[PDB]
Design a protein around this ligand. Structure first.
Ligand SMILES: Nc1ncnc2c1ncn2[C@@H]1O[C@H](COP(=O)(O)OP(=O)(O)O)[C@@H](O)[C@H]1O
Ligand SMILES: Nc1ncnc2c1ncn2[C@@H]1O[C@H](COP(=O)(O)OP(=O)(O)O)[C@@H](O)[C@H]1O
Ligand SMILES: [Mg+2]
Ligand SMILES: [Mg+2]
Lengths: 98, 525, 49, 540
């Protein structure tokens, strides 16, 4: 969770906040960005700091998403964004992708 | 069937296989479609669905009606899902998708009955849909001038067309102008949460207003609030996230004293903490104070003594809208209330709105948000007005992203049907029947428009087909004149993406329904 | 690694509009006011902020 | 005619579409329209008897057996226990009219019922309901323009209140409090004018306190330019009357201070106990002295206080009241001109409110005491005290006064008026009829139906008063055509003349405009519904 005062002071210094509940998503983000999940609020050292080509808030259809995007044609994790007119159709496409 | 001593699946597992289940699925899709047919076009009607608790809902939107229907047929649920998809991606055309998909299925039903292989039908649908989408992209009219007045007129006409099927269609020009004005204030993302929609009971539809700022209901003022002035001519607004009350310093704070002097000092320290927060707020220069957290009676009386306005428990989205309109910052701490974190509006006022008290922030020149105040005689009346305005807002947003339009009223459907028939005449013949069936199914929209309007559908369709064949692209149904007319010159304009997504979703749903050969339903746990 | 390929399902535009993104997508929103960074310098914390 | 569809497939396999579809019901098209029209007609016919000075009341009984006798249409429909969705729409329309205007809650329902009744015949003739709705909308536009045309302005000035008195009397004529007609109207007008921002701004109703106590007479209802308080003086031996009272409004209980944060005061020796006892005694003496130093005569508290403070207040000639509610504290502070003080340390002379007379009032053999804070200097808050022979007429007087206050508020918002008694309806019907002749044929039927529906209000007024409806309405319409006078209505009171301008039957223009607008919108909304899907489960 994010404290109100912490959110205030982060907004004051122009810092983007993302709150991932699931530890799996945090681990995958660490893999795909190259950062290390620090256990304290200490400022990150140079090696532990992650890097990405672009991070932004975007809307696809009617769902708001947060995108971590690499301009290079490489990376540890790549994602496939599946569109469709039905949930069942997208599930079948996901099975085909698997 | 021979009863095996130990059966394969569980007791009560029901399985339907073969052509009969496909025909039953098509019939179920038809049944779902006919529940929304009459809600199509300017002469469409509304449906009244009552839930289990007796809270009725009235709507003209196909997606809403389908959602309120407790559809349990597995094949029929695909139509509801594609209606939801069309509402999410576009926001308009939630009825056309269902009618088009059901008409596709109905047209191919006779061939299914005679043992035609469903993969052939699926391939034919894919080919026809690809061709139709390409034709829509090719023939869509675009304005390559980037003119302000022309683009605004395009937005207003698109909003008018999207609105001329609802109960606010009589005031459609007024509401379309308001919707276009509201949308043009959004900065770059056109987020829906930046367009507030307040519904206040009582009043005519023409009494609805759009405020160039932010407005919200009064939120449980404490004692001493009535001595605060209710009008400011150049206020500075202190947007805060602070609880201005006498309370425990923390939930785990314990005070240990052993002297009465220390007791008095502790009480005075609590009072001094509260008064220090209040004095910092007052010395910030602000006149209007808003907080997400509650503001106590002591703070209310303090601000009344200083001729200031306060309001606690303001909803978070309303504070975001006020921040965007005035240009401040939601401060969780009052230690640094500099001039750059304070909102500013020309006029703040609290007025009576139909039996309720609303706070009005107007005159914001840099506002990136707006608030709709909808008036009506009933809760469902205002809810349907809100749904109609949402449809118009989504249409205007999509038009803002790209200004490609096609004439409505079935003109595009006739053009696509003619093109698909012309293509089908030039193929070997097994795909020919299916592509012709697709083209014929494309004729459902103007036929349903004529049926809803009480015309003679056959004569209108014959005239439209003749006009399209002999030359003319944007000829559709003219409801008022009981005849056909050039719908492009009649300003029946809709974005091309509406029809594109409608055709794509209908084709995908039809292919998914056709591809199924067996349905197995396990017993409920 | 199979798990390195993530699938995000977003309804609305048909499967022909699907695309491959070199990164990750989270169907969520930002807590603060900043909604876009061009030269991101992510610092990941596993502890509450 | 119901149960949706039932086919079970042409192959004999089960055909289940909607959950619990075999226990649900549905109506489509003209049958649903006719059912809606029938329900609305029933509601409107029930309501139409409570229209006009000769209108009759409805006795409403709730779940717990409590009884309310009323003529207010919005209250009648709110308490009426409906199940039909269209009836709920009528109830909500009446509530909307009450919210926006405050008067005319019965006329809207009758007008909507008449409009739907005419739409029934129009549909039977074979007209699409959307065409009927469009014709109704444009006829309503014409009627609203005519209402603006024939309106008249009045003076809302304080010096001359006679037009306001006449308007309030016209509003109160249909209520049971007409036995004190002019008195009730005048107190309502004075109440609204006292608590009002002058420059056509809002009239804030939290500054009007409406209180009803049984006993006495209805004529004893009076306007108090101050605050009536259900509380009394804390000590039984305190004086029962204070003259030229200098009020001291406080929100701090007269008790030793208590920190909000969790705390513990450790007592470790006998000296600590002595210091604590001396601290308590000195805190009581200090708070009493701080109250007394400002020169105040009366102390008003919100959170009560204990015995030592009570006896110290009595001993120091300081009458006091405890446990006063927050709204009452705010009203007292507004009326007396004082400031709400959160603790004695901040109490000064300039924060003291002044009241000419503070008195405790008895109510016969009831032991019930109430406090009057009146004779303020420039009281910006007002209170209405209602008496009566039983609680039911007290509640009815409360809602009648609310209607009068709402009407005067509407007059403040807009000073244009039209003359009631059905004169406005007849003139609007005539204007719609003249407009229909120039219109193409197809919308003529809708416009004529709208005019005939508008003609129902004079018919209801004449029938309620015993006169023949059709003959009286036709004669009045013929007179209005013969001589240009939109002020001729239905002489319900049998005063001899039909000129409502002379009879001083006055209504707010915005009230009529809202009536017509809301009726038209609700009629259109009902006419656009062609399908019902009730659960039909008959659940308990
Ligand atoms: N003024 C008009 N004249 C003729 N056709 C119209 C007019 N306005 C809208 N339509 C048609 O009505 C159809 C349905 O629109 P609408 O009912 O608003 O939403 P949906 O497409 O979700 O049903 C559209 O395809 C459009 O072509
Ligand atoms: N003295 C009067 N003479 C003739 N008509 C009157 C008189 N007073 C009231 N009316 C009419 O009686 C109608 C009903 O008014 P009332 O019952 O007070 O409120 P509502 O309009 O809510 O029923 C009004 O439309 C008004 O024109
Ligand atoms: Mg539409
Ligand atoms: Mg009345």
């Amino acid at each position: 969770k994010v404290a109100d005062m912490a959110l205030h002071y982060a907004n004051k210094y122009n810092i983007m906040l993302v709150r991932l509940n699931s530890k799996w998503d945090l681990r995958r983000l660490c893999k795909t960005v190259g950062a290390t999940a620090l256990p304290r609020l200490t400022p990150p050292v140079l090696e532990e700091m992650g890097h990405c080509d672009s991070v932004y808030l975007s809307e696809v259809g009617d769902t708001q998403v947060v995108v971590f995007k690499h301009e290079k044609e490489d990376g540890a994790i790549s994602t496939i964004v599946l569109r469709g007119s039905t949930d069942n159709l997208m599930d079948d496409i996901e099975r085909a992708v698997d | 069937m021979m009863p095996t001593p130990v059966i394969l699946l569980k007791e009560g597992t029901d399985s339907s296989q073969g052509i009969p289940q496909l025909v039953s699925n098509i019939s179920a899709c038809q049944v779902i479609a006919e529940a929304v047919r009459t809600t199509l076009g300017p002469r469409g009607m509304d449906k009244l669905i009552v839930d289990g608790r007796g809270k009725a809902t009235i709507s003209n939107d196909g997606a809403t009606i389908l959602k309120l229907l407790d559809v349990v047929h597995p094949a029929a649920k695909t139509l509801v899902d594609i209606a939801k998809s069309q509402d999410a991606e576009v926001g308009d055309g939630t009825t056309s998708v269902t009618l088009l998909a059901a008409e596709f299925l109905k047209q191919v039903k006779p061939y299914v009955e005679e043992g035609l292989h469903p993969q052939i039908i699926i391939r034919a649908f894919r080919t026809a849909t690809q061709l139709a989408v390409n034709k829509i992209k090719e023939i869509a009219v675009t304005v390559k001038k980037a003119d302000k007045v022309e683009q605004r007129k395009l937005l207003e006409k698109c909003a008018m067309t999207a609105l001329s099927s609802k109960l606010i269609s009589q005031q459609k020009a007024f509401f379309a102008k308001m919707v276009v004005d509201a949308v043009m204030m959004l900065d770059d993302l056109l987020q829906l949460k930046m367009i507030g929609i307040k519904k206040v009971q009582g009043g005519a539809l023409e009494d609805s207003q759009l405020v160039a700022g932010v407005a919200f209901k009064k939120t449980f003022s404490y004692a001493g609030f009535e001595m605060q002035p209710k009008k400011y001519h150049n206020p500075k607004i202190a947007l805060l996230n602070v609880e201005l009350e006498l309370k425990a310093e923390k939930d785990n704070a314990e005070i240990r004293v052993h002297t009465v002097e220390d007791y008095q000092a502790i009480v005075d320290a609590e009072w001094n903490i509260l008064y220090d927060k209040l004095e910092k707020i007052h010395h910030s220069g602000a006149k209007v104070v808003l907080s997400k957290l509650p503001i106590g009676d002591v703070a209310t009386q303090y601000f009344a003594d200083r001729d200031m306005f306060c309001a606690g428990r303001v909803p978070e989205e309303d504070l975001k809208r006020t921040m965007m309109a005035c240009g401040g910052s939601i401060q969780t701490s009052v230690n640094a209330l500099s001039a750059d974190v304070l909102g500013r509006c020309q006029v703040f006022e609290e007025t009576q709105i139909g039996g309720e008290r609303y706070n009005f922030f107007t005159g914001c020149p840099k506002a990136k948000t707006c608030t709709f105040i909808l008036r009506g005689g009933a809760e469902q009346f205002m809810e349907e007005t809100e749904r109609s305005l949402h449809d118009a807002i989504m249409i205007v947003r999509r038009a803002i992203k790209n200004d490609s339009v096609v004439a409505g009223g079935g003109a595009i459907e006739m053009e696509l049907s003619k093109y698909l028939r012309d293509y089908s005449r030039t193929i070997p013949g097994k795909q020919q029947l299916l592509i012709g069936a697709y083209a014929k199914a494309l004729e459902i929209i103007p036929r349903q428009l004529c049926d809803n309007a009480g015309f003679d559908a056959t004569n209108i369709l014959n005239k439209l087909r003749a006009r399209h064949a002999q030359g003319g692209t944007w000829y559709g149904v003219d409801i008022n004149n009981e005849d056909i007319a050039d719908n492009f010159e009649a300003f029946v304009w809709e974005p091309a993406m509406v029809r594109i997504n409608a055709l794509t979703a209908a084709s995908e749903a039809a292919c998914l329904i056709v591809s199924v050969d067996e349905t197995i339903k396990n017993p409920r746990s | 690694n199979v798990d390195n390929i993530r699938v995000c399902k977003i309804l609305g535009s048909g499967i022909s509009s699907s695309s491959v993104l070199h990164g990750m997508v989270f169907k969520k929103e930002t807590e603060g006011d900043v909604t876009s960074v061009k030269d991101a310098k992510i610092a990941v914390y596993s502890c509450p902020f | 005619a119901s149960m949706g569809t039932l086919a079970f497939d042409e192959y004999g396999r089960p055909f289940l579409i909607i959950k619990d579809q075999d226990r649900k019901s549905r109506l489509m098209g003209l049958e649903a329209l006719k059912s809606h029209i029938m329900a609305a007609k029933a509601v409107a016919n029930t309501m139409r008897t409570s229209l006009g000075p000769n209108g009759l009341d409805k006795m409403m009984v709730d779940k717990d057996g409590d009884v309310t006798v009323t003529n207010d249409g919005a209250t009648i429909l709110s308490m009426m226990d409906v199940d039909h969705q269209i009836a709920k729409l009528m109830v909500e329309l009446s509530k909307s009219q009450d919210d926006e205007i405050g008067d005319g809650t019965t006329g809207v329902v009758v007008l909507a019922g008449a409009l739907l009744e005419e739409a029934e015949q129009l549909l039977d003739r074979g007209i699409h309901p959307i065409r009927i709705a469009d014709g109704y909308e444009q006829a309503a536009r014409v009627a609203i323009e005519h209402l603006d045309k024939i309106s008249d302005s009045v003076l809302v000035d304080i010096k001359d209140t006679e037009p306001l008195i006449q308007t309030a009397k016209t509003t109160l004529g249909s209520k049971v409090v007409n036995s004190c007609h002019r008195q009730m109207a005048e107190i309502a007008v004075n109440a609204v004018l006292t608590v009002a921002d002058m420059e056509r701004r809002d009239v804030d109703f939290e500054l009007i306190k409406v209180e009803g106590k049984v006993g006495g007479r209805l004529e004893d209802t009076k306007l108090i330019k101050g605050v009536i308080v259900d509380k009394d003086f804390s000590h039984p031996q305190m004086p029962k009357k204070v003259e030229d009272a200098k009020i001291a409004i406080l929100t701090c209980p007269f008790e030793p201070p208590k920190p909000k944060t969790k705390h513990k005061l450790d007592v470790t020796s006998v000296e600590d106990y002595k210091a604590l006892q001396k601290y308590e005694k000195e805190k009581f003496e200090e708070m009493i002295q701080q109250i007394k130093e400002t020169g105040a005569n009366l102390a008003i508290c919100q959170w009560g206080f204990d015995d030592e403070a009570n006896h110290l207040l009595l001993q120091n000639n300081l009458p006091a009241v405890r446990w006063v509610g927050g709204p009452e504290i705010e009203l007292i502070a507004i009326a007396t001109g004082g400031r709400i003080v959160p603790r004695f340390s901040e109490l000064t002379a300039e924060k003291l409110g002044f009241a000419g007379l503070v008195q405790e009032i008895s109510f016969g053999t009831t032991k019930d005491k109430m406090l009057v804070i009146e004779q303020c200097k420039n009281s910006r808050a007002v209170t209405i005290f209602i008496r009566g022979g039983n609680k039911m007429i007290i509640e009815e007087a409360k809602r009648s006064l609310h209607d009068a206050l709402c009407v005067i508020r509407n007059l403040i918002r807009d000073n244009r008026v039209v003359y009631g008694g059905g004169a406005a309806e007849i003139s609007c019907a005539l204007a719609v009829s003249q407009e229909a002749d120039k219109c193409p044929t197809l919308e003529q039927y809708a416009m004529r139906a709208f005019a005939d529906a508008l003609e129902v209000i004079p018919m209801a007024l004449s029938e309620n008063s015993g006169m023949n409806p059709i003959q009286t309405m036709t004669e009045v319409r013929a007179r209005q055509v013969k001589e240009m006078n939109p002020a001729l209505g239905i002489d319900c009171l049998h005063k001899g003349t039909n000129d409502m301008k002379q009879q001083h039957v006055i209504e707010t223009l915005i009230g009529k405009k809202q009536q017509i607008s809301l009726a038209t919108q609700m009629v259109r909304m009902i006419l656009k519904i062609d399908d019902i899907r009730k659960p039909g489960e008959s659940e308990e």
